Design a binder for this molecule. Structure first.
Ligand SMILES: *[C@@H]1O[C@H](CO)[C@@H](O)[C@H](O)[C@H]1NC(C)=O
Ligand SMILES: *[C@@H]1O[C@H](CO)[C@@H](O)[C@H](O)[C@H]1NC(C)=O
Ligand SMILES: *[C@@H]1O[C@H](CO)[C@@H](O)[C@H](O)[C@H]1NC(C)=O
Lengths: 114, 103, 107, 109
């Protein structure tokens, strides 16, 4: 929250935990198209405190502050061996990550019906 | 004791009914309508593509209750993710619902 | 939604193993002790290497694809292990429980 | 309820059972004035399957489906020579059943 107050930049972090062994592939997509490695930086796979041999890795993506407030959904897609499909992904936008508004307009009609 | 009148699993409505056994009086009984809609509150417009605005409306006509909001636990939803690793682009099928289906 | 509440006795030396159903598709299978005060469910045993802080080193997981029983065993009983242990699957823990059962101390 | 979801017409039935002898008369009033004979149809008396010497009838009034939707009484008047005043009548409304108390339980937790 305090990072989206200076109105300078926003950092979204993709954290992959529990994977073994190391050397996992991670990248970012912006509205269904990938980005160059000049805007996101991944970290080397480091060991895990409570795990015998499981690891973890971080991938930060920095974007302009106004590029995140208007929408512009970001996705992090990763590909480690162990995945049953070998590829998975997650996604965030301004309306999903720690929102301050549950704008609900649920309507229910034909309660009796047949 | 309750008859499962509706067990919709794509909009998640769980309408049912029963007859409440009142006292041994004239039959001024009561018929029950335990409708139980569950709101996802965090899903997307299409349930199978995480790129659309999230969700404002939740329409429940109980006559078309016997596009969706939620995800079927026994069903699999996937997508094509456009990864590259350099120059080539192997558009590979991802999983939007890891654990409801396996390769 | 199975509710096979059994009265398996326990003690310090005593060992009790619960039985649970498995989908066998290598999902997340867990045993969870529900907390009455919290109103939520706290995983005591999971598919991963997680073990509850109170139950560190005294619990064992035992999976048979052959016979379709998913069973977990507790080495020692401190007599405080009386609660709703529910098994299950899926990533979720609370809202995913398949069968629940409450174990017991002494007898 | 099933017939009103077709959004075409509404069918009200005046059931006259348990009278004796025959020759019962039925009319369909609305706000005092009667309805045309081409709006309702009356069947001939037939004997009761269990009761030995009694009869029954029917009187179907079919109206537009929307017209039922706004109040509108449709009271059925029956004349038979055994009634205390030789005339009786009944009425229904869209609102003619019971309280149907809703019991909403909205949850935000
Ligand atoms: C909240 O939802 C309503 C209903 O569609 C919409 O008109 C309004 O713009 C929404 N508010 C915001 C801030 O998006
Ligand atoms: C978004 O919704 C459309 C409409 O059904 C459907 O094709 C799909 O769920 C989504 N689109 C894509 C390209 O995935
Ligand atoms: C519905 O009414 C019954 C009794 O009339 C009551 O016990 C129940 O709590 C009500 N349902 C609610 C408040 O959701």
């Amino acid at each position: 929250r305090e990072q989206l107050n200076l109105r300078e930049s926003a950092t979204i972090t993709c954290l992959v935990t529990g994977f073994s062994p190391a050397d996992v592939f991670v990248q970012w997509m912006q509205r269904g198209q990938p980005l160059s490695p000049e805007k996101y930086v991944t970290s080397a796979p480091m060991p895990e405190p409570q795990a015998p041999g499981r690891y973890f890795a971080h991938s930060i993506l920095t974007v302009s502050e106004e590029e995140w407030n208007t929408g512009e959904t970001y996705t992090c897609v990763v590909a480690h061996e162990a995945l049953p499909n070998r590829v998975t992904e997650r996604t965030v936008d301004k309306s999903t990550g720690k929102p301050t508004l549950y704008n609900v307009s649920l309507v229910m009609s034909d309660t009796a019906g047949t | 004791e309750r008859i499962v009148l509706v067990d919709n699993k794509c909009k998640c409505a769980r309408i049912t009914s029963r007859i409440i056994r009142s006292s041994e009086d004239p039959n001024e009984d009561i018929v029950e309508r335990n409708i139980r809609i569950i709101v996802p509150l965090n899903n997307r417009e299409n349930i199978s593509d995480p790129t659309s605005p999230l969700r404002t409306r939740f329409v429940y006509h109980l006559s078309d209750l016997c596009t969706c909001y939620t995800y079927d636990r026994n069903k699999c939803y996937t997508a094509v993710v456009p990864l590259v690793y350099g120059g080539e682009t192997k558009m590979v099928e991802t999983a939007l619902t890891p654990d409801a289906c396996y390769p | 939604r199975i509710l096979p509440e059994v009265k398996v006795e326990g003690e310090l030396g005593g060992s009790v193993t619960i039985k649970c159903p498995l989908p066998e598709m290598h999902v997340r299978i867990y045993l969870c002790r529900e907390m009455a005060g919290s109103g939520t469910c706290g995983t005591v045993v999971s598919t991963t290497n997680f073990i509850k802080a109170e139950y560190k080193g005294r619990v064992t997981l035992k999976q048979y694809p052959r016979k379709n029983l998913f069973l977990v065993e507790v080495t020692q009983l401190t007599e405080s292990d009386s609660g709703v242990y529910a098994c299950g699957a899926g990533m979720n823990t609370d809202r995913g429980k398949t069968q629940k059962v409450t174990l017991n101390v002494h007898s």
